[PDB]
Amino acid sequence: STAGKVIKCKAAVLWEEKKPFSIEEVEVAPPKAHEVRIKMVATGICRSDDQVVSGTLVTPLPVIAGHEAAGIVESIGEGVTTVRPGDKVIPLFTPQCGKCRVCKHPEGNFCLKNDLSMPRGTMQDGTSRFTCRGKPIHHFLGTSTFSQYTVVDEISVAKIDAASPLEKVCLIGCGFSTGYGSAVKVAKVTQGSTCAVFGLGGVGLSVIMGCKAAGAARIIGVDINKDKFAKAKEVGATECVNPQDYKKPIQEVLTEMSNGGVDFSFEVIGRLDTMVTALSCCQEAYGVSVIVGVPPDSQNLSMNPMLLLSGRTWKGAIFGGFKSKDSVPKLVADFMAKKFALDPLITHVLPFEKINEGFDLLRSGESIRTILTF
Amino acid sequence: STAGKVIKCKAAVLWEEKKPFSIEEVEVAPPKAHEVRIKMVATGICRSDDQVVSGTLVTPLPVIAGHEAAGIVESIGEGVTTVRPGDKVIPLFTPQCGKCRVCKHPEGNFCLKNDLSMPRGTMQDGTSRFTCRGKPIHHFLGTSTFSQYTVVDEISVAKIDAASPLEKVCLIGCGFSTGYGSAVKVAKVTQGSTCAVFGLGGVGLSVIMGCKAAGAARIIGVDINKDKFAKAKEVGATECVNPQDYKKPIQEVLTEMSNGGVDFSFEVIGRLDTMVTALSCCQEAYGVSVIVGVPPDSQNLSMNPMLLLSGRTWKGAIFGGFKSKDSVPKLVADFMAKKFALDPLITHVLPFEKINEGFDLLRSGESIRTILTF
Ligand SMILES: NC(=O)c1ccc[n+]([C@@H]2O[C@H](COP(=O)([O-])OP(=O)([O-])OC[C@H]3O[C@@H](n4cnc5c(N)[nH+]cnc54)[C@H](O)[C@@H]3O)[C@@H](O)[C@H]2O)c1
């Protein structure tokens, strides 16, 4: 009988860029028509959430960030047909409205109702469900998972298997699905190919998992932090290189290593220089390079279009190119059937109240995914 | 007989940039091992040839330019197995060695023996077959068709149908195959799609022909020269737009016209600014943009990688992604079988001696393809 009532709960509020989260009481309004209020069970720390703190991924402040999570439906608004109270759910930071030209396109997944391209920090109706100290607080990507309760639009939630371990399957809400889809759906990595993966965090390890699933012969991990190399080999990297070890630019090293350039390269960091380097290192006539990393807000890169004229393909994607509401329940079902592993991504577990310690672990280079439990 | 002897003949020599072609007597050495000497019958004037004069496409000078042509084999060197004296042939400015990693790849066509990436202006053996006034003259892309005779490496020539009309099929050497393949093979334009083609010269009109062949529902031609619109409509444009007619940038106009972005865009000009515009006008989640135009030497473009992260694909190609020696004889057979038209591309047919008047017709906006006849 919290149904129809304001919930007072703890959330991690970001009042200001480059400051710690403030764990404090917020007020969470009840769900309006076509909205769902979720009791959160577990949420992951994704670099994109850190980018919001850094100000390199811009979204209105103050905000409740968090987008990689799983919980249990507390109540549904009028007209909700796709989940019920007590259902296990994953919030979808990329919505699936099912009505727009993108949702109807066979390849498209970046639904026109997304809050990423031109962030408002609201529900679909342009208003907020969150109050803190009597002030309105922004949403993030229609999810806001750094809260004991959130409200999402129906197009931004998926029902998942009732027996799902939510402290693992929360990674299906971003990092795993993003990296794995980037390889198997966006790049379409082929059997016997040579891949280069720039960035060996939670998302680039998921890229390596997808390249290995697709049958790549060589998977070259690239990171300036050699501490990331052991786990990258465990999930399928055949060799790892640190650009800081070489006199030559790493695109030239990777071209030499691959006897004239790789089949598939992935930028999984979020830097302009590594996006150009990852394009350059794929073979000039038939190579494919996929941008996964989120670049710093409003900055342009510089490149020589002769890299494309020879035959390269350059593309990017959000959430691994997955249509989110169709894909997430299937990804959970596939996990439950042992088709891929999530434990190799989980390096740390903390209570929600230690969110700032979780961010210090990511920033220090010590963690892959920290999972916070409510 | 000329076989085994030096030929003295007329060629158009470019002694330095931004000067008219010099029509004069050159000496053409006989073919060495795995080389073919061709009597030229017809050659087209491609914008790429004008870019060598402008210095925006760098190749060593002095040079015999020309790459879009057809002629008749005069003689063959030792070891030549794929052509014989008297054969009709098209020189291949993109070779097909059949041995490199690119030639063996199912998609690849930019053979590693090409002279486009790092132009030397020689035969494969690093030497020239041309002298003029006692000076060695460079080759251009392994072809050098602005001459009554040329010598090419065997991997840079294809045998075509003995009954083919050389004054038309010379365009299969460059402009027609490039534009048509860019649409049907590289973009893989789909039935009912909306296409935007930037540049309505010979190559852009050939892109329109491919988009129409692939069953596009809308083909928007873009040119700053409105005199190009009537012919673009004859070959399949459904509408034409001149960016100079609008207060708004044309990417915004084309996004509004296509109710959120086109399925397929093509840059067929060679400008950095229209390469970025063409990418931007394709739908942000599923759009594809192909660079066909040759960009200006050593210059970088500036772009926001968020254009790719949302889901766009950006790619470029040489020669329409056709494997040159396999494809050219099949394109000629397809032409003979009336599967496509070339006459719409041909606005002017001049004797070879009028090469400069041919270039001035292109530069002035008055021609599509001028065919020079020997
Ligand atoms: N496209 C999407 O939908 C999607 C979703 C998830 C994450 N992202 C982005 O993907 C990127 C990675 O996220 P993550 O895996 O959580 O981050 P992470 O755990 O910080 O991993 C990034 C890795 O990059 C390494 N790195 C940093 N700088 C360089 C360098 N110059 N050269 C080589 N390696 C370097 C770094 O050491 C680290 O291991 C971030 O930009 C996220 O914002 C995008």
Ligand SMILES: NC(=O)c1ccc[n+]([C@@H]2O[C@H](COP(=O)([O-])OP(=O)([O-])OC[C@H]3O[C@@H](n4cnc5c(N)[nH+]cnc54)[C@H](O)[C@@H]3O)[C@@H](O)[C@H]2O)c1
């Ligand atoms: N990729 C290949 O294999 C390949 C082969 C053939 C030609 N090309 C290149 O393709 C391009 C076109 O060749 P072409 O068709 O012979 O040239 P063309 O006949 O000069 O056509 C170019 C067209 O672009 C129009 N144009 C020029 N500037 C603009 C502008 N700012 N906005 C809109 N329209 C503009 C112009 O009026 C002209 O109709 C050139 O850069 C060639 O070098 C490349």
Ligand SMILES: [Zn+2]
């Ligand atoms: Zn994320």
Ligand SMILES: [Zn+2]
């Ligand atoms: Zn949608």
Ligand SMILES: [Zn+2]
């Ligand atoms: Zn050309």
Ligand SMILES: [Zn+2]
């Ligand atoms: Zn080859």
